PDB file of C-alpha atoms and ligand atoms in Angstrom:
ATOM      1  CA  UNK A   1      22.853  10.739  -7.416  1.00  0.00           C
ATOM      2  CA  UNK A   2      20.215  10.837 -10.117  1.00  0.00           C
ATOM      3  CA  UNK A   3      20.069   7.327  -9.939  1.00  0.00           C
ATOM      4  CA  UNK A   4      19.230   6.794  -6.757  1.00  0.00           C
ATOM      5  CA  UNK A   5      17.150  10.054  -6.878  1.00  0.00           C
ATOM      6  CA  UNK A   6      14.937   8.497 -10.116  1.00  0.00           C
ATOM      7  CA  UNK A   7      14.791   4.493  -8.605  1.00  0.00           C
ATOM      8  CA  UNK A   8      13.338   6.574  -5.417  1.00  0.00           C
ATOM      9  CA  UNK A   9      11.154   8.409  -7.429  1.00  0.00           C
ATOM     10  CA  UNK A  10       9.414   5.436  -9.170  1.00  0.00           C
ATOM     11  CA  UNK A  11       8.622   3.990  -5.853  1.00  0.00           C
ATOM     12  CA  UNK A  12       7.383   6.900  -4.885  1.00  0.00           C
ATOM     13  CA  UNK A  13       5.120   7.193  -7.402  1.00  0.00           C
ATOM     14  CA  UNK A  14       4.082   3.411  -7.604  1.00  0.00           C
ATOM     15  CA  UNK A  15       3.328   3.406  -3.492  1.00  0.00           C
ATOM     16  CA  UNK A  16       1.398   6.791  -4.247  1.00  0.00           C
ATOM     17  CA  UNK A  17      -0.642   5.355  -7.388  1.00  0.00           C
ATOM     18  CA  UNK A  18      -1.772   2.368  -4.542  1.00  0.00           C
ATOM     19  CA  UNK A  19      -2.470   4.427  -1.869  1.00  0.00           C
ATOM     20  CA  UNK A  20       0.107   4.342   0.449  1.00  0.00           C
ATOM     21  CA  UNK A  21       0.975   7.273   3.261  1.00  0.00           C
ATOM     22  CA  UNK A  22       4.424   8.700   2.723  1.00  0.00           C
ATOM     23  CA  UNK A  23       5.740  11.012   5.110  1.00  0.00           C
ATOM     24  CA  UNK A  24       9.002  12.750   5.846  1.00  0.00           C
ATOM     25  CA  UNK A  25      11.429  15.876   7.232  1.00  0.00           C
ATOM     26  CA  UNK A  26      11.634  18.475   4.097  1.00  0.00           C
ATOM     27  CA  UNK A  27      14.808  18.597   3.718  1.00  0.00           C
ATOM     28  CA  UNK A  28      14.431  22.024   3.090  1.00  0.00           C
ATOM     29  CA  UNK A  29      12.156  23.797   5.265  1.00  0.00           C
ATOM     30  CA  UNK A  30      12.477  21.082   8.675  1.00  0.00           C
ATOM     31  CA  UNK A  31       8.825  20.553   8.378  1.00  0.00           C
ATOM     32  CA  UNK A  32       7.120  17.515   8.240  1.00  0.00           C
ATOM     33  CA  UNK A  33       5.069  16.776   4.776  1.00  0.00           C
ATOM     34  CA  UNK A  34       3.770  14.123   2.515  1.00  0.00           C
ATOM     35  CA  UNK A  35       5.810  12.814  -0.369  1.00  0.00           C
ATOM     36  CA  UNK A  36       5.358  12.874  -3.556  1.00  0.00           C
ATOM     37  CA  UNK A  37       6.319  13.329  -6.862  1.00  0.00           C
ATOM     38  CA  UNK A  38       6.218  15.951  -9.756  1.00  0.00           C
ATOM     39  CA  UNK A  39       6.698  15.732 -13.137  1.00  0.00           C
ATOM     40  CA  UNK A  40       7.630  18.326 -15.730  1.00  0.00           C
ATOM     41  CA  UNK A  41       5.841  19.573 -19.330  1.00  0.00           C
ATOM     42  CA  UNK A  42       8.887  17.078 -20.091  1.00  0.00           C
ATOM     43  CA  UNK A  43       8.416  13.452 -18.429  1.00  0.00           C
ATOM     44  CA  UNK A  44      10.827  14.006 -15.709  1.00  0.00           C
ATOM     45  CA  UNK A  45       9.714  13.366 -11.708  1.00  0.00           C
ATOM     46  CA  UNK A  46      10.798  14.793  -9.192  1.00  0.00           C
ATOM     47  CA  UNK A  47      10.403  14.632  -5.585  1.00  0.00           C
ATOM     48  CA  UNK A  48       9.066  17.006  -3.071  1.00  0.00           C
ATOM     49  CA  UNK A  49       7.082  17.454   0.408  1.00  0.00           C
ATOM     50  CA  UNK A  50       3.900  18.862   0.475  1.00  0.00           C
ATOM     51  CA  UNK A  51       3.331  20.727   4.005  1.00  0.00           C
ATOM     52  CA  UNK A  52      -0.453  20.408   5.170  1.00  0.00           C
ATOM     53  CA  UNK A  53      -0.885  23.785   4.266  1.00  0.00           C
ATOM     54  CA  UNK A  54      -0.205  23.765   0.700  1.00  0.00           C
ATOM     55  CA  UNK A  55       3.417  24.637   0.541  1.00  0.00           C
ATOM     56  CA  UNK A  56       5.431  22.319  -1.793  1.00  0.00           C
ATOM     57  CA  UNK A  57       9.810  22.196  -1.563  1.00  0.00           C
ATOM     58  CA  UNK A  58      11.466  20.291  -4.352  1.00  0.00           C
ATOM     59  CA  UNK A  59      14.020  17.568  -2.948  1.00  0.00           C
ATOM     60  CA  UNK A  60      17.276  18.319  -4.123  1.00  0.00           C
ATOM     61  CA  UNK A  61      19.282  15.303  -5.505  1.00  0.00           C
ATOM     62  CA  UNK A  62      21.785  15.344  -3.036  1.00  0.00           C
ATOM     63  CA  UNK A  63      20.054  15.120   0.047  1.00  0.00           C
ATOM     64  CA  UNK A  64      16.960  12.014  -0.487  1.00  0.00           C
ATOM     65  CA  UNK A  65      18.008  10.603   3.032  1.00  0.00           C
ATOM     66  CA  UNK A  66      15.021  11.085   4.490  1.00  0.00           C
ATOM     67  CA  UNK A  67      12.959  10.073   2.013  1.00  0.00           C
ATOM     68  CA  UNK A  68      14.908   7.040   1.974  1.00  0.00           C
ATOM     69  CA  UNK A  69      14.131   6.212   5.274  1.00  0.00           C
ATOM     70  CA  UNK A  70      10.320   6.259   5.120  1.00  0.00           C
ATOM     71  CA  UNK A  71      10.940   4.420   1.982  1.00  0.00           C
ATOM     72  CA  UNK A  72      12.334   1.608   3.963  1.00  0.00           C
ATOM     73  CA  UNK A  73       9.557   2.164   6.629  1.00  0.00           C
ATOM     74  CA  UNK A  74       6.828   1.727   3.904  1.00  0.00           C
ATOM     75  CA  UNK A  75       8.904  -1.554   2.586  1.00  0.00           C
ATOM     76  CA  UNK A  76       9.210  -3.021   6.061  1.00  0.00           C
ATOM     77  CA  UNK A  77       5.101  -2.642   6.637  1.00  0.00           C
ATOM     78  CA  UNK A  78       4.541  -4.226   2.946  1.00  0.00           C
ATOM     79  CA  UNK A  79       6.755  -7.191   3.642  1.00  0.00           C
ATOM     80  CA  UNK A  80       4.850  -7.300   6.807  1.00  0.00           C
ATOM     81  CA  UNK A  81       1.501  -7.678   4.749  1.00  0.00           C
ATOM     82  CA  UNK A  82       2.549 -10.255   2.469  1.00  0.00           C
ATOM     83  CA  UNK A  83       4.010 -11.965   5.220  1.00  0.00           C
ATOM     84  CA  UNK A  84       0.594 -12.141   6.402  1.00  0.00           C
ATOM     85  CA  UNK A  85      -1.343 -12.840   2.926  1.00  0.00           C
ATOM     86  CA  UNK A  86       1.523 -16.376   2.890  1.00  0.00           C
ATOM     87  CA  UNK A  87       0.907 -17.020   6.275  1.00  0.00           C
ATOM     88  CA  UNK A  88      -3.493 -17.289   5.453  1.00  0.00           C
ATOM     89  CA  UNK A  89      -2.691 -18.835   2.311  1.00  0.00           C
ATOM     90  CA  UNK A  90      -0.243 -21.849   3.403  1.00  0.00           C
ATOM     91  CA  UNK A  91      -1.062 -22.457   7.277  1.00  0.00           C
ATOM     92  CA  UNK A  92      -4.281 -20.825   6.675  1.00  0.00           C
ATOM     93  CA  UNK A  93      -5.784 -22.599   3.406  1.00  0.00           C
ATOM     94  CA  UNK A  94      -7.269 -19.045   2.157  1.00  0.00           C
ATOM     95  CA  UNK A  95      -6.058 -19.317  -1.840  1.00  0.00           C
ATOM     96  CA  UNK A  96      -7.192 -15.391  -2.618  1.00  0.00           C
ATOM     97  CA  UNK A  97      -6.056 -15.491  -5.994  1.00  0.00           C
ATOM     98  CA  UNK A  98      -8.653 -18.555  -7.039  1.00  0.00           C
ATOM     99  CA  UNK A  99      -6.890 -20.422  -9.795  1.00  0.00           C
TER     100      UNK A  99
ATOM    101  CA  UNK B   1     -15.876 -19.832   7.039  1.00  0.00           C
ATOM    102  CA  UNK B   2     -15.212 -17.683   9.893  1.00  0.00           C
ATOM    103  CA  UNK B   3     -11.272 -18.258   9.798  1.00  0.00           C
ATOM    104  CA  UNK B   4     -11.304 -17.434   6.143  1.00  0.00           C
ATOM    105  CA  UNK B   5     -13.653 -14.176   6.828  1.00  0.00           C
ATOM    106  CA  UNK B   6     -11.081 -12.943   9.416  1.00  0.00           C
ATOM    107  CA  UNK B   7      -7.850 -13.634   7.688  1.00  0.00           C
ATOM    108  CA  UNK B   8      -9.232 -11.577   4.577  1.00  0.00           C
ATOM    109  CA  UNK B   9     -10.734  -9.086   7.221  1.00  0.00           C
ATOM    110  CA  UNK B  10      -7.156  -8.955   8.845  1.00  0.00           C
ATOM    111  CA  UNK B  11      -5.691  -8.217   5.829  1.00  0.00           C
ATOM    112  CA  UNK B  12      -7.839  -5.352   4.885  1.00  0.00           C
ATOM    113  CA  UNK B  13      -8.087  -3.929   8.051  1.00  0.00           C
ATOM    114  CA  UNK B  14      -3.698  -3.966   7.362  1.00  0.00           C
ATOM    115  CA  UNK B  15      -4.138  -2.242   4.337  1.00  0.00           C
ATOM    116  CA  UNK B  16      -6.888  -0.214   4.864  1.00  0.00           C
ATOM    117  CA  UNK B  17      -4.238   1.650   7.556  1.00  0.00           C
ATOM    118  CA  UNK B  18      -2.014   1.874   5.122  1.00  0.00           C
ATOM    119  CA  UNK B  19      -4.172   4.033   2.538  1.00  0.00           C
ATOM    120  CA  UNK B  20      -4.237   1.116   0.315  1.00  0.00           C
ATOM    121  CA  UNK B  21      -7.152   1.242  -2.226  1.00  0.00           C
ATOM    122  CA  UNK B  22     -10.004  -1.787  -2.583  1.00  0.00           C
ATOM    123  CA  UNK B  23     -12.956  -1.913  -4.613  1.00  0.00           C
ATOM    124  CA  UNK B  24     -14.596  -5.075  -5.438  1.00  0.00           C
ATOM    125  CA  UNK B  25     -18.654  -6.232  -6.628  1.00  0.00           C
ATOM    126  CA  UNK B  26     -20.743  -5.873  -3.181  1.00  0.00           C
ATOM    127  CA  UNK B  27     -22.540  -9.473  -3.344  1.00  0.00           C
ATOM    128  CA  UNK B  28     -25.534  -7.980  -2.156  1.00  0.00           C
ATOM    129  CA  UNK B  29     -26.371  -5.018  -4.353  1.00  0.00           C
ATOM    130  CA  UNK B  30     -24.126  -6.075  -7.399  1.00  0.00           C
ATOM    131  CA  UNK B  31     -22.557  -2.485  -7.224  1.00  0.00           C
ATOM    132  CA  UNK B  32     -19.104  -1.606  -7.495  1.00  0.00           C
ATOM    133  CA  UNK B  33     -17.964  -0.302  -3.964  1.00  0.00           C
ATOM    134  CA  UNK B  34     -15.214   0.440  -1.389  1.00  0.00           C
ATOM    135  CA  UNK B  35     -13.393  -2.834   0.527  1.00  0.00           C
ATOM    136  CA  UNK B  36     -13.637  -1.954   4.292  1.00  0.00           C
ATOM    137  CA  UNK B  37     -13.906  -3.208   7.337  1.00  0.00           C
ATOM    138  CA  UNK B  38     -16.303  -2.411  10.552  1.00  0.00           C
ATOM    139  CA  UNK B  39     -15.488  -3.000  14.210  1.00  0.00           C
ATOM    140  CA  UNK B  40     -18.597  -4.179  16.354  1.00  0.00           C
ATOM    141  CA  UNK B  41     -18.756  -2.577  20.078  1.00  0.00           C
ATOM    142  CA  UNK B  42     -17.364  -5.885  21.552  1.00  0.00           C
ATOM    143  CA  UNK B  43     -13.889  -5.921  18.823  1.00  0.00           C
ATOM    144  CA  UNK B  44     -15.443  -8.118  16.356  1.00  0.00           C
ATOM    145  CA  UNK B  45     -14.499  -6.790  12.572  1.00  0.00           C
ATOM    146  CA  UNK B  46     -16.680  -7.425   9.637  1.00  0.00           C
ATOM    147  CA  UNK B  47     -16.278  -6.649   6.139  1.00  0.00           C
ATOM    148  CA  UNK B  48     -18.378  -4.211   4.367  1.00  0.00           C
ATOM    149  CA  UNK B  49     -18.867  -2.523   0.661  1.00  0.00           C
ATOM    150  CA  UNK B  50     -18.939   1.472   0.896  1.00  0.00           C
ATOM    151  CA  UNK B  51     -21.072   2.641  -2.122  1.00  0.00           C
ATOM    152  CA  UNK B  52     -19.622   5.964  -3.437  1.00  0.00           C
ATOM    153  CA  UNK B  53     -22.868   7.315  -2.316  1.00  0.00           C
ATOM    154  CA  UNK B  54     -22.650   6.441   1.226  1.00  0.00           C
ATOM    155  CA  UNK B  55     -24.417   3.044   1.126  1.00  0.00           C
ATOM    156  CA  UNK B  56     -22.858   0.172   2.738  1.00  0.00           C
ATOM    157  CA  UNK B  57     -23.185  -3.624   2.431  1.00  0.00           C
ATOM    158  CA  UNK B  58     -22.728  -6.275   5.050  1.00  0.00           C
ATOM    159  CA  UNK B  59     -20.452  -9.200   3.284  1.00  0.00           C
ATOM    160  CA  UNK B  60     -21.869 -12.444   4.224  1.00  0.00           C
ATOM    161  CA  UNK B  61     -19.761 -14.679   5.166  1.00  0.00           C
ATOM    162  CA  UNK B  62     -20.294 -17.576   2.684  1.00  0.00           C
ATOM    163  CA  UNK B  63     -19.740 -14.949  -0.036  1.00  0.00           C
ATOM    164  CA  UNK B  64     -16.510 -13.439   0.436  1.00  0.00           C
ATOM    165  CA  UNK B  65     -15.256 -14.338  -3.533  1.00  0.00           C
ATOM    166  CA  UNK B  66     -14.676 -10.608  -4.669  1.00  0.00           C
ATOM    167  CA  UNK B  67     -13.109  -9.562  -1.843  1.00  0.00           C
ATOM    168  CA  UNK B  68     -10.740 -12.120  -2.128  1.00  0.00           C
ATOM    169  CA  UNK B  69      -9.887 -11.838  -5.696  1.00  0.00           C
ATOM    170  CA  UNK B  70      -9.518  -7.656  -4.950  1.00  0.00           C
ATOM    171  CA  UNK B  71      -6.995  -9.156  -2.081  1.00  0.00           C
ATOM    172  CA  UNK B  72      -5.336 -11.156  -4.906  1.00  0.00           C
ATOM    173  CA  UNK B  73      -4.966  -7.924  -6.990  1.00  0.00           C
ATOM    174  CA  UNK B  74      -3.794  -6.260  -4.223  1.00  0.00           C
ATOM    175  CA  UNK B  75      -1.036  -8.614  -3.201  1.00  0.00           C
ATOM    176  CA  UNK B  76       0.025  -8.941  -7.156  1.00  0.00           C
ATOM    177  CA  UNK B  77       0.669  -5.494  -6.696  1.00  0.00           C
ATOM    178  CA  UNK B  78       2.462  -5.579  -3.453  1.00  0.00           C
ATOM    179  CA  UNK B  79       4.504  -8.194  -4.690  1.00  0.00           C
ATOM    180  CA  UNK B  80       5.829  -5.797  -7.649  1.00  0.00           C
ATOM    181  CA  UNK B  81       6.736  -3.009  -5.386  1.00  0.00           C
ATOM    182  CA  UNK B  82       8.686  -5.014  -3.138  1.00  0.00           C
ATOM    183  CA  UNK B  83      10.487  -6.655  -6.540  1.00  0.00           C
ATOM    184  CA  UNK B  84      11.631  -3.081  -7.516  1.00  0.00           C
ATOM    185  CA  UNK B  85      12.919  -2.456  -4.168  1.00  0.00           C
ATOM    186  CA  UNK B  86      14.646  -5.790  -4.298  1.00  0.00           C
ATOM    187  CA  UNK B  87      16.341  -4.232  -7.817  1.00  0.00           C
ATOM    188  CA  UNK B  88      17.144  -1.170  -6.506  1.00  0.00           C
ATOM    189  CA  UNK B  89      18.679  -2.172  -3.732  1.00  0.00           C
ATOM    190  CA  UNK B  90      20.625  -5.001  -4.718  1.00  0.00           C
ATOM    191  CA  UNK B  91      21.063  -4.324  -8.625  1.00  0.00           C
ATOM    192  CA  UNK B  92      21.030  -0.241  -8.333  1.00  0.00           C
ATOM    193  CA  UNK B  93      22.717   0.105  -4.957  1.00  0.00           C
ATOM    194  CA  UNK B  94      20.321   1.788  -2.879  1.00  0.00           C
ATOM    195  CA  UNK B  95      20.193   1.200   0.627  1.00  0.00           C
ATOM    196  CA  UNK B  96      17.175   2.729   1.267  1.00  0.00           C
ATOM    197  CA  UNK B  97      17.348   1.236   4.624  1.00  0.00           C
ATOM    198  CA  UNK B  98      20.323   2.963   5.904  1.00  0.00           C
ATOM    199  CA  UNK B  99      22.149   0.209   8.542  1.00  0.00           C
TER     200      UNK B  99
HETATM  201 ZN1   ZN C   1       9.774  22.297   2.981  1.00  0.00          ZN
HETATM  202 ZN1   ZN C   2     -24.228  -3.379  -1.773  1.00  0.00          ZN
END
């Protein structure tokens, strides 16, 4: 569990430090919030929803299923995008990354 | 020109959606600015530099080198997230797709 809970954390907080919307069911409350992560006076994150409103619930290790499924909606739309980026590049002749 | 100018515009119209953040050199003022996109009233997109106080650029469309090397940046990045999902999934056992 605190495996899976930590490698879901550090996406978390790469696809945060880019940007990227993360949404999900709190697995607490039943409300919908953003996701992201916490970390303690002592280098650990952890995961929680934030609910528009402020209110923040700590994702308990057990139960990370549904932030593992927006996890795998965010990868799907990524793969999508560099899909794209190889598809301009070879049939398109765009080089973006001039070298 | 054009086809490169819309690919690139594609792409950061893709990201843009996603929350992912662009800044690049605007080639007309030489400030630092915001990568977006702007949507004529007859669907045409164009690419634009957002200065963070409210100016924006036109990007002509002989001149599209910084947006494309911000694009390159951006897909480095992209790239690394989807490798860490690749090793969680298949060397940590996460199926954060759950099928
Ligand atoms: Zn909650
Ligand atoms: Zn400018």
């Amino acid at each position: 569990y605190k495996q899976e809970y930590d490698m879901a954390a550090d996406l978390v907080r790469m696809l945060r430090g880019l940007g990227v919307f993360m949404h999900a069911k709190c697995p607490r409350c039943g409300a919908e919030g953003s996701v992201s992560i916490v970390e303690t006076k002592n280098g650990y994150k952890y995961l929680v929803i934030r609910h528009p409103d402020g209110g923040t619930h700590t994702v308990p290790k057990t139960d990370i299923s549904a932030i593992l499924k927006e996890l795998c909606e965010v990868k799907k739309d990524l793969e999508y995008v560099l899909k794209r980026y190889k598809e301009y590049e070879e049939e398109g002749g765009v080089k973006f990354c001039a070298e």
